[PDB]
């Protein structure tokens, strides 16, 4: 959660529709 900004993009394409990274 913390640093919901560009932080956590290390696994964006991964999260997939995780509404967290790529949203």
How far is it, in rounded angstroms, from Cα 5 to Cα 1? 9
How far is it, in rounded angstroms, from Cα 1 to Cα 20? 9
Task: Tell me the HSE value of 7 on the side-chain side, using a 13 A CA sphere.
Answer: 5
Q: Hey, what are 7's tokens?
A: 């932080």
For 16, counting Cβ atoms within 10 Å of its Cβ (0-12 exposed, 13-18 middle, 19+ buried), the class is: exposed
Contact 10, 22 (CB under 8 A): no
SS3 assignment for the chain: CCCCCCCCHHHHHHHCCCCCCCC
How far is it, in rounded angstroms, from Cα 9 to Cα 16? 11
**Whats the size of the chain, residue-wise?**
23
In the DSSP assignment, the letter for residue 14 is H
Contact 8, 2 (CB under 8 A): no
**End-to-end Cα distance, the chain:** 13
Contact 22, 13 (CB under 8 A): yes
């Amino acid at each position: 959660f913390n640093a919901p900004f560009d932080v956590g993009i290390k696994l964006s394409g991964a999260q997939y529709q995780q509404h967290g990274r790529a949203l």
